[PDB]
């Protein structure tokens, strides 16, 4: 009369990610109402999109405009492990997730005096297969997927960095053996080399509308 | 049944040409989804290892048929054996670490550990062979794997392809050598 | 809801498995904030 | 109140061929779309039928036409273990499966010069109970289930080998004690013995429409 | 599908047991190739 | 959330007669068609009824007709262990089953010369409570449930032996302590005592329409 | 059928539990033999 059943090996071990729920102790607790408790966020990429965070340019988010040639104010990898992204909320969020896809957004807010004027261009350099390079003048970077803006009444400029890669998803962490980037560079040229004096361009980053992380991981640090 | 062979047109004649009828058979054991779906043995007495699916022995059914295909897609099921407390599994692209925490983990039950690994690799398809500047006039890249298992103690390991989809056929060869006799001749129980 | 799921359903009553919620009668923000975003290009776009 | 149940002995051991599926770890993964990924094959006998592979005639797929009598260009068993089939895709596929039934197909493509002409015949000899024999002249092989073709504008000739046996299925592997074949011979006579000079007939094999393997096996080699 | 089968059905949701597929929207070959075969005898068959 | 269940003691041990079926290894085998495979028998009592088998009268199935008085050609127990039944298919079938009920059938086929004539009678003696006896003349056996036949154009005679016992079923094997039969005797008198010469009556037995065995058993022999 | 029986039914599909039979298309004897028997008494029965 007893129902036959066959317990199997390899099943029923403790699992820290298993769907099944634990057996109850107390019953009929009633939590205090959380109505009008403001600020809930149901998904981390939402706060990643609505809340841009500043880049780490040698400990200071802004880039200083400069008189000497050079012209390459910054030239950094579109990779979350890069030192520039080190303080950003996205690098800290993607420190955990294993893979991603989709565009990033970079916000450039000019901060200099109203009489001071400048012109800038940013360019996205696709991964190589590049013997270096990278281009150090705007005329050289013009060929690449770029955009260019001059300072005006509307200070901020939002440049979107496309996700261009052979594979549908790409690793957030960089593999130990590499002589070149797998997600490509981006660079922020000034384009006139006569600036008395100083000025500054604050830079920040936030996830694009279509960005998507996948596979949570909890890497041992260090 | 003469026909030009240079065009490589398919030709399949039944004995009907000599007056013998032959009804079509509905073969099931030759089916890919049915054959590939088994726990092939892969490796013995090993703690940490990448879950590369090319670790399968080439003489085994699953490994040979897997090498009969250029591309493939599989959900996977791992089954460790031998004494051990627990088994961690890092999803593809997760950084390697000697210690592990919070990464997905399964305790053994009666010295067996079976669990299902979702397809993880970024590529829409994996491949058993990859022409990465290996030109010749006469090795697969690390991204091609389902994860990275680690065991508390060394364990035997099994892989089970699920929802298998093989693409672009490649040659099978018999493993046996005929030696002096042209017919191989083997014992049968 | 969450990382839970079965074709069946939880054996114990909901009163035993989870604490009941109570309305303030005898919500999400960042979704709305992210949806407030203006992707539409500013100024007179050309070409 | 607890549901009675009776765990049984002999059930729930680990099984490498069991129907039941393993318990999940990750959830909600979404595989990249495989649309427009060409060349999928859902069954191995399909590629076995559509893709004929060459026979191993002493390391060379072709048979050379010859002046001296003999006339028996080949006389080989219709068995997958035979040395002639050793390179073929079917012998390698049936190296694993335990049993089969159904007709094979042999393709004969003449390759010689357009002015050179020849006539051939192939014959299928049923298993014996044969004291040897096998017949070494076409006049002797004429009695058997045969076919005969001369070279012309259409080079290829497809001879189908019938499955004739007492049992509905027959073993792929040959049992160790045997003094005679259990699936029978096939032989490819030339029929004129005057050929200056050389010429060649490529030979290949592919599964027939009705062929069927059964019982996968993974034999230890060697 | 494949070497799986039960009168019942898998206890866990499909989302947990198997990776979901995605269409390229916001296939088989060798079956067709084998079906392209011409078994019909060539030339003028007689007797 | 896990379903409560209570494994019980005394259940789930290995059982060689249990209804439940074993877990599968291979799938989708297709057995060869057994159509037109003649001679199947779905029940052993059918072959027991349609196929009578000969009795063991001192190593020879026939009884010889004799001149000297005696007149009792045979007098044997209606019990399967009796030496007379030792070669019969029923004794061999009921060697295994533990209990039975229902009538037996005995076939008597006369075999002597057409000019030779004889008259016979068979009688069924109910179990006793018999101090012996058994009756040795036909006049004495006439009182019992008997039947009587003379040889003619129709040689065979089929005498049915009734199942008369206090209990609804009776053991096939004989219990070790017994001084008298529990199923009764049957005897085959000749009735004239003048027979020159010899002649013979073949005897055989087969299960009746209503006979029924119950409880398979596999006794250790010896 | 046979010495098997349950209120429920076998958990695995029939394809996995038992080998499938195949008709010779793209039986019992001794029952009939035993039913052929003539129990009717021969000759002119009387009384």
TrEMBL record, chain B:
It comes from Foot-and-mouth disease virus serotype SAT-2. The chain holds residues 527 to 736 of 740 of the full protein. Lies on the inner surface of the capsid shell. After binding to the host receptor, the capsid undergoes conformational changes. Capsid protein VP4 is released, capsid protein VP1 N-terminus is externalized, and together, they shape a pore in the host membrane through which the viral genome is translocated into the host cell cytoplasm. After genome has been released, the channel shrinks. This is Genome polyprotein. Residues 23-171 form the Picornavirus capsid VP1 domain. It is found in: Host cytoplasm; Virion. Residues 1-21 are annotated as: Disordered.
TrEMBL record, chains C, E, G:
It is found in: Host cytoplasm; Virion. It comes from the Viruses. Lies on the inner surface of the capsid shell. After binding to the host receptor, the capsid undergoes conformational changes. Capsid protein VP4 is released, capsid protein VP1 N-terminus is externalized, and together, they shape a pore in the host membrane through which the viral genome is translocated into the host cell cytoplasm. After genome has been released, the channel shrinks. VP0 precursor is a component of immature procapsids. This is Genome polyprotein. It comes from Foot-and-mouth disease virus serotype SAT-2 (FMDV). The chain holds residues 15 to 85 of 740 of the full protein.
């Amino acid at each position: 009369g007893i129902i036959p059943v066959a317990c199997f090996d390899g099943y029923g071990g403790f699992q820290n990610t298993d769907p099944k729920t634990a057996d109850p102790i107390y019953g009929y607790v009633y939590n205090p109402s959380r109505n009008d408790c403001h600020g809930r966020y149901s998904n981390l990429l939402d706060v990643a999109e609505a809340c841009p965070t500043f880049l780490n340019f040698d400990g200071k988010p802004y880039v200083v405009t400069k008189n000497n040639g050079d012209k390459v104010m910054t030239c950094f990898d579109v990779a979350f492990t890069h030192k520039v992204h080190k303080n950003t909320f996205l690098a800290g969020l993607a420190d955990y997730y294993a893979q991603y896809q989709g565009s990033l957004n970079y916000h450039f807010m000019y901060t200099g005096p109203t009489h001071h004027k400048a012109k800038f261009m940013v360019a996205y350099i696709p991964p190589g297969i590049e013997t270096d390079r990278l281009p150090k003048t705007p005329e050289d970077a013009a060929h690449c997927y770029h955009s260019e803006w001059d300072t005006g009444l509307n200070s901020q400029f939002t440049f979107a960095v496309p996700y261009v890669s052979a594979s549908d998803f790409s690793y957030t962490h960089t593999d130990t053996p590499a002589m070149a980037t797998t997600n490509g560079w981006v660079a922020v040229f000034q384009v006139t080399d006569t600036h008395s004096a100083e000025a500054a361009v604050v830079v920040s980053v936030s996830a694009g509308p279509d960005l998507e992380f996948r596979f949570p991981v909890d890497p041992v640090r260090q | 049944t003469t026909s030009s062979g240079e065009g490589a047109d398919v030709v399949t004649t039944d004995p009907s040409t000599h007056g013998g009828a032959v009804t079509e058979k509905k073969r099931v054991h030759t089916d890919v989804a049915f054959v590939m779906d088994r726990f092939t043995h892969v490796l013995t007495n090993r703690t940490a290892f990448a879950v590369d699916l090319m670790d399968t022995n080439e003489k085994t059914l699953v490994g040979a048929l897997l090498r009969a295909a250029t591309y493939y897609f599989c959900d996977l099921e791992i089954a460790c054996l031998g004494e051990h407390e627990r088994v961690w599994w890092q999803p593809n692209g997760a950084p390697r670490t000697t210690t592990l925490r919070d990464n997905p983990m399964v305790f053994s039950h009666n010295n067996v550990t079976r669990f299902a690994v979702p397809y993880t690799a970024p590529h829409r398809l994996l491949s058993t062979r990859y022409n990465g500047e290996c030109k010749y006039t006469q090795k697969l890249p690390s991204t091609f794997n389902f994860g990275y298992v680690t065991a508390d103690k060394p364990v035997d390991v099994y892989y089970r392809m699920k929802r298998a989809e093989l693409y672009c056929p490649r040659p099978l060869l018999p493993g046996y050598d005929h030696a002096d006799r042209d017919r191989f001749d083997s014992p049968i129980g | 809801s969450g990382n839970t799921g079965s074709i069946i359903n939880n054996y114990y009553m909901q009163q035993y498995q989870n604490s009941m919620d109570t309305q303030l009668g005898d919500n999400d923000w960042f979704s709305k904030l992210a949806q407030s975003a203006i992707s539409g290009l500013f100024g007179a776009l050309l070409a």
